Structure 1
Protein backbone atom coordinates (compact mmCIF):
# COMPACT_ATOMS: atom_id res chain seq x y z
CA UNK A 1 0.00 0.00 0.00
CA UNK A 2 0.92 3.62 -0.60
CA UNK A 3 1.04 6.05 2.31
CA UNK A 4 0.91 9.78 1.69
CA UNK A 5 0.14 12.75 3.91
CA UNK A 6 -3.20 14.07 4.88
CA UNK A 7 -4.63 16.65 2.46
CA UNK A 8 -6.38 19.84 3.49
CA UNK A 9 -10.16 20.16 3.33
CA UNK A 10 -10.92 22.03 0.13
CA UNK A 11 -13.85 24.37 0.72
CA UNK A 12 -16.12 25.12 -2.26
CA UNK A 13 -15.13 27.87 -4.64
CA UNK A 14 -16.66 31.10 -5.91
CA UNK A 15 -19.07 29.78 -8.51
CA UNK A 16 -20.61 27.09 -6.32
CA UNK A 17 -24.13 28.51 -6.08
CA UNK A 18 -25.04 27.08 -9.49
CA UNK A 19 -23.62 23.78 -8.30
CA UNK A 20 -26.88 21.82 -7.51
CA UNK A 21 -27.96 21.87 -11.16
CA UNK A 22 -25.68 20.33 -13.78
CA UNK A 23 -24.37 22.50 -16.63
CA UNK A 24 -26.42 20.86 -19.36
CA UNK A 25 -29.61 21.89 -17.59
CA UNK A 26 -28.29 25.46 -17.42
CA UNK A 27 -27.61 25.32 -21.16
CA UNK A 28 -31.14 24.17 -21.95
CA UNK A 29 -32.44 26.93 -19.67
CA UNK A 30 -30.71 29.64 -21.72
CA UNK A 31 -31.91 28.12 -24.99
CA UNK A 32 -35.51 27.83 -23.79
CA UNK A 33 -35.32 31.36 -22.37
CA UNK A 34 -34.38 32.70 -25.78
CA UNK A 35 -36.98 30.61 -27.57
CA UNK A 36 -39.89 31.52 -25.30
CA UNK A 37 -39.21 35.23 -25.59
CA UNK A 38 -38.86 35.07 -29.37
CA UNK A 39 -42.02 32.97 -29.83
CA UNK A 40 -43.88 35.40 -27.57
CA UNK A 41 -42.57 38.22 -29.73
CA UNK A 42 -43.95 36.47 -32.81
CA UNK A 43 -47.49 36.02 -31.49
CA UNK A 44 -47.84 39.70 -30.83
CA UNK A 45 -46.83 42.36 -33.39
CA UNK A 46 -48.36 40.20 -36.10
CA UNK A 47 -50.42 42.93 -37.80
CA UNK A 48 -53.25 43.09 -35.21
CA UNK A 49 -56.38 44.21 -37.00
CA UNK A 50 -55.90 53.85 -36.15
CA UNK A 51 -53.93 51.60 -33.82
CA UNK A 52 -53.25 48.61 -36.05
CA UNK A 53 -49.80 47.58 -34.84
CA UNK A 54 -49.19 49.23 -31.45
CA UNK A 55 -52.13 47.42 -29.81
CA UNK A 56 -49.71 45.73 -27.43
CA UNK A 57 -46.56 46.94 -25.68
CA UNK A 58 -44.57 43.74 -26.32
CA UNK A 59 -41.56 44.49 -28.40
CA UNK A 60 -38.74 41.96 -28.58
CA UNK A 61 -36.93 43.64 -25.72
CA UNK A 62 -40.07 43.95 -23.61
CA UNK A 63 -40.59 40.22 -24.09
CA UNK A 64 -36.95 39.61 -23.23
CA UNK A 65 -37.69 41.54 -20.05
CA UNK A 66 -40.97 39.71 -19.33
CA UNK A 67 -39.55 36.20 -19.56
CA UNK A 68 -36.67 36.99 -17.22
CA UNK A 69 -39.17 38.75 -14.98
CA UNK A 70 -41.48 35.77 -14.75
CA UNK A 71 -38.60 33.37 -14.15
CA UNK A 72 -37.34 34.89 -10.92
CA UNK A 73 -40.71 35.23 -9.18
CA UNK A 74 -41.40 38.92 -9.60
CA UNK A 75 -43.84 39.61 -12.41
CA UNK A 76 -43.39 42.80 -14.38
CA UNK A 77 -45.96 45.52 -14.96
CA UNK A 78 -47.30 44.44 -18.35
CA UNK A 79 -49.33 41.31 -19.09
CA UNK A 80 -49.84 39.40 -22.40
CA UNK A 81 -53.34 40.94 -22.73
CA UNK A 82 -54.43 38.69 -25.62
CA UNK A 83 -54.86 34.99 -26.34
CA UNK A 84 -52.22 32.65 -27.80
CA UNK A 85 -49.29 34.42 -26.26
CA UNK A 86 -50.69 33.29 -22.99
CA UNK A 87 -50.51 29.63 -23.83
CA UNK A 88 -46.86 30.42 -24.12
CA UNK A 89 -46.82 32.30 -20.84
CA UNK A 90 -48.78 29.75 -18.83
CA UNK A 91 -46.49 27.00 -20.00
CA UNK A 92 -43.54 29.19 -19.06
CA UNK A 93 -45.11 29.74 -15.63
CA UNK A 94 -45.46 25.98 -15.23
CA UNK A 95 -41.84 25.67 -16.28
CA UNK A 96 -40.67 28.20 -13.74
CA UNK A 97 -42.68 26.55 -11.00
CA UNK A 98 -41.28 23.08 -11.59
CA UNK A 99 -37.67 24.26 -12.04
CA UNK A 100 -36.87 26.53 -9.13
CA UNK A 101 -38.81 24.41 -6.65
CA UNK A 102 -36.43 21.66 -7.69
CA UNK A 103 -33.56 24.15 -7.43
CA UNK A 104 -34.18 25.21 -3.85
CA UNK A 105 -34.83 21.79 -2.37
CA UNK A 106 -31.52 21.23 -0.62
CA UNK A 107 -29.42 24.28 -1.52
CA UNK A 108 -27.78 24.70 1.89
CA UNK A 109 -26.24 21.24 1.66
CA UNK A 110 -24.41 22.35 -1.49
CA UNK A 111 -22.70 25.36 0.05
CA UNK A 112 -20.97 23.48 2.88
CA UNK A 113 -19.43 20.38 1.33
CA UNK A 114 -15.63 20.28 1.89
CA UNK A 115 -14.56 17.26 -0.15
CA UNK A 116 -10.93 16.24 -0.61
CA UNK A 117 -8.57 16.47 -3.58
CA UNK A 118 -6.59 13.15 -3.74
CA UNK A 119 -3.70 13.80 -6.21
CA UNK A 120 -2.71 10.18 -6.95
CA UNK A 121 -4.20 6.78 -6.27
CA UNK A 122 -3.02 4.00 -8.64
CA UNK A 123 0.32 5.31 -8.52
CA UNK A 124 1.74 5.64 -12.07
CA UNK A 125 2.31 9.39 -11.74
CA UNK A 126 5.09 8.28 -9.46
CA UNK A 127 6.36 7.00 -12.77
CA UNK A 128 5.15 10.01 -14.76
CA UNK A 129 5.98 13.22 -12.88
CA UNK A 130 9.29 14.02 -11.20
CA UNK A 131 7.95 16.12 -8.33
CA UNK A 132 6.74 13.92 -5.47
CA UNK A 133 9.34 11.46 -4.25
CA UNK A 134 8.76 7.93 -2.93
CA UNK A 135 10.89 5.20 -1.37
Structure 2
Protein backbone atom coordinates (compact mmCIF):
# COMPACT_ATOMS: atom_id res chain seq x y z
CA UNK A 1 0.00 0.00 0.00
CA UNK A 2 1.34 3.40 -1.11
CA UNK A 3 -1.34 6.05 -1.52
CA UNK A 4 -0.80 8.38 -4.50
CA UNK A 5 0.38 11.85 -3.58
CA UNK A 6 -0.85 15.21 -4.78
CA UNK A 7 2.13 16.52 -6.72
CA UNK A 8 3.15 13.08 -7.95
CA UNK A 9 2.94 14.07 -11.60
CA UNK A 10 6.48 15.41 -11.09
CA UNK A 11 7.96 12.00 -10.26
CA UNK A 12 9.45 10.98 -13.67
CA UNK A 13 11.93 13.87 -13.65
CA UNK A 14 13.85 14.43 -10.43
CA UNK A 15 14.04 17.68 -8.48
CA UNK A 16 17.25 18.91 -10.08
CA UNK A 17 15.66 18.47 -13.53
CA UNK A 18 12.66 20.64 -12.65
CA UNK A 19 14.75 23.40 -11.13
CA UNK A 20 17.09 23.44 -14.13
CA UNK A 21 14.16 23.68 -16.55
CA UNK A 22 13.31 26.94 -14.80
CA UNK A 23 16.91 28.17 -14.86
CA UNK A 24 17.02 27.32 -18.57
CA UNK A 25 13.69 28.94 -19.41
CA UNK A 26 14.86 32.20 -17.82
CA UNK A 27 18.16 31.80 -19.66
CA UNK A 28 16.74 31.18 -23.12
CA UNK A 29 14.21 34.00 -22.73
CA UNK A 30 16.74 36.64 -21.66
CA UNK A 31 19.16 35.53 -24.38
CA UNK A 32 16.43 35.56 -27.04
CA UNK A 33 15.40 39.05 -25.91
CA UNK A 34 18.98 40.29 -26.06
CA UNK A 35 20.07 38.84 -29.41
CA UNK A 36 16.91 40.20 -31.03
CA UNK A 37 16.57 43.77 -29.74
CA UNK A 38 20.04 44.81 -28.54
CA UNK A 39 21.22 45.96 -31.99
CA UNK A 40 20.50 49.65 -32.65
CA UNK A 41 21.09 49.02 -36.36
CA UNK A 42 18.16 46.62 -36.83
CA UNK A 43 15.86 49.02 -34.96
CA UNK A 44 13.54 51.20 -37.10
CA UNK A 45 9.28 50.66 -34.28
CA UNK A 46 11.25 47.53 -33.44
CA UNK A 47 12.40 45.01 -36.04
CA UNK A 48 10.86 42.04 -34.23
CA UNK A 49 8.13 41.45 -31.67
CA UNK A 50 10.53 39.53 -29.39
CA UNK A 51 10.54 41.88 -26.45
CA UNK A 52 11.20 40.51 -23.00
CA UNK A 53 7.57 39.64 -22.25
CA UNK A 54 7.11 38.18 -25.74
CA UNK A 55 10.33 36.18 -25.31
CA UNK A 56 9.03 34.59 -22.12
CA UNK A 57 5.85 33.53 -23.94
CA UNK A 58 7.64 32.14 -26.99
CA UNK A 59 9.96 30.12 -24.75
CA UNK A 60 6.95 28.82 -22.80
CA UNK A 61 4.85 27.77 -25.77
CA UNK A 62 7.91 25.96 -27.10
CA UNK A 63 8.38 23.91 -23.93
CA UNK A 64 4.67 23.14 -23.66
CA UNK A 65 4.76 21.88 -27.28
CA UNK A 66 2.10 24.46 -28.20
CA UNK A 67 2.52 27.10 -30.89
CA UNK A 68 3.08 30.83 -30.63
CA UNK A 69 2.38 33.67 -33.03
CA UNK A 70 6.03 34.67 -33.56
CA UNK A 71 9.07 32.84 -34.92
CA UNK A 72 12.55 34.44 -34.83
CA UNK A 73 13.66 35.64 -38.27
CA UNK A 74 17.36 36.24 -37.61
CA UNK A 75 20.33 33.89 -37.42
CA UNK A 76 21.10 34.81 -33.81
CA UNK A 77 17.46 34.41 -32.83
CA UNK A 78 16.98 31.22 -34.81
CA UNK A 79 19.87 29.47 -33.04
CA UNK A 80 18.28 30.15 -29.64
CA UNK A 81 14.97 28.89 -30.98
CA UNK A 82 16.58 25.73 -32.34
CA UNK A 83 18.68 24.68 -29.35
CA UNK A 84 15.57 25.20 -27.20
CA UNK A 85 13.26 23.15 -29.40
CA UNK A 86 15.81 20.34 -29.19
CA UNK A 87 16.09 20.64 -25.41
CA UNK A 88 12.29 20.69 -25.11
CA UNK A 89 12.01 17.60 -27.31
CA UNK A 90 14.44 15.48 -25.29
CA UNK A 91 12.84 16.50 -21.99
CA UNK A 92 9.20 16.03 -22.98
CA UNK A 93 10.15 12.61 -24.34
CA UNK A 94 12.12 11.71 -21.21
CA UNK A 95 9.03 12.52 -19.14
CA UNK A 96 6.57 10.44 -21.16
CA UNK A 97 9.12 7.62 -21.38
CA UNK A 98 9.98 7.64 -17.68
CA UNK A 99 6.32 7.95 -16.71
CA UNK A 100 5.62 4.88 -18.85
CA UNK A 101 8.31 2.96 -16.97
CA UNK A 102 6.70 4.06 -13.69
CA UNK A 103 3.28 2.73 -14.69
CA UNK A 104 4.39 -0.46 -16.46
CA UNK A 105 6.61 -1.92 -13.73
CA UNK A 106 5.36 -1.27 -10.20
CA UNK A 107 8.24 -1.94 -7.81
CA UNK A 108 -1.94 -1.85 -14.44
CA UNK A 109 -5.39 -0.36 -13.90
CA UNK A 110 -6.89 2.87 -15.19
CA UNK A 111 -5.09 5.97 -14.01
CA UNK A 112 -6.99 7.49 -11.09
CA UNK A 113 -7.91 11.09 -10.36
CA UNK A 114 -5.72 11.18 -7.23
CA UNK A 115 -2.78 10.41 -9.54
CA UNK A 116 -3.30 13.75 -11.29
CA UNK A 117 -5.38 15.52 -8.64
CA UNK A 118 -2.47 17.96 -8.32
CA UNK A 119 -2.37 19.28 -11.88
CA UNK A 120 -6.05 20.20 -11.53
CA UNK A 121 -5.23 22.37 -8.51
CA UNK A 122 -2.49 24.34 -10.26
CA UNK A 123 -5.04 24.86 -13.02
CA UNK A 124 -7.72 26.31 -10.74
CA UNK A 125 -5.09 28.27 -8.84
CA UNK A 126 -3.79 29.71 -12.09
CA UNK A 127 -7.34 30.58 -13.15
CA UNK A 128 -7.81 32.28 -9.79
CA UNK A 129 -4.58 34.24 -10.06
CA UNK A 130 -5.59 35.17 -13.61
CA UNK A 131 -8.81 36.83 -12.47
CA UNK A 132 -7.01 38.66 -9.66
CA UNK A 133 -4.33 40.02 -12.01
CA UNK A 134 -7.11 41.22 -14.31
CA UNK A 135 -9.35 42.85 -11.70
CA UNK A 136 -6.40 44.55 -9.99
CA UNK A 137 -5.43 46.29 -13.23
CA UNK A 138 -9.12 47.14 -13.70
CA UNK A 139 -9.45 48.55 -10.16
CA UNK A 140 -6.28 50.62 -10.63
CA UNK A 141 -7.29 51.69 -14.14
CA UNK A 142 -10.75 52.53 -12.79
CA UNK A 143 -9.97 54.91 -9.93
CA UNK A 144 -6.99 56.52 -11.66
CA UNK A 145 -9.37 57.37 -14.51
CA UNK A 146 -12.07 58.99 -12.38
CA UNK A 147 -9.36 60.80 -10.41
CA UNK A 148 -8.05 61.96 -13.84
Per the normalisation by structure 2, the TM-score is 0.64
Shift in Å, 1:59: 0.8
Partner in structure 2 of residue 30 of structure 1: 22
1:12, 1:114 within 8 Å by CA — same for their partners in 2? no
State which drifts further: 103-112 or 65-74. 103-112
CA distance in 1, matches of 2:20, 2:93: 17
- Of stretches 78-87 and 31-40 in structure 1, the one that deviates more from structure 2 is 78-87
User: In 2 relative to 1, CA 62–71 (structure 1 residues): closer, same or farther, beyond 3 Å?
Assistant: same
Q: Provide the residue aligned with 2:48 in structure 1.
A: 56
Unpaired runs of 5+ residues, structure 2, are 108-148
Partner of 2:124: none
State the shift of 1:99 in Å: 0.8
Question: Aligned-pair distance for 1:81?
Answer: 1.4
Q: 1:77 and 1:114, CA in 2 relative to 1: closer, same or farther beyond 3 A? A: same
Partner of 2:13: 21
Q: Render the CA deviation track for 1:85-118: whole Å, top value 9, x for unaligned.
A: 1111100011011111111014255469988xxx
SS at match of 2:12: coil
Structure 1 unaligned blocks of 5 or more: 1-8, 116-135
Count of aligned residue pairs for this structure pair: 106
Q: Which runs of 4+ in 1 moved over 2 A?
A: 108-115
Largest Rg, 1 or 2: 1
- The CA deviation string for residues 38-79 of structure 1, in whole angstroms up to 9 with x for no partner, is 000000112342x62511111100000000000111120111
> Normalization by structure 1: what TM-score?
0.70
Please say which of residues 81-90 and 61-70 is displaced more in the overlay.
81-90
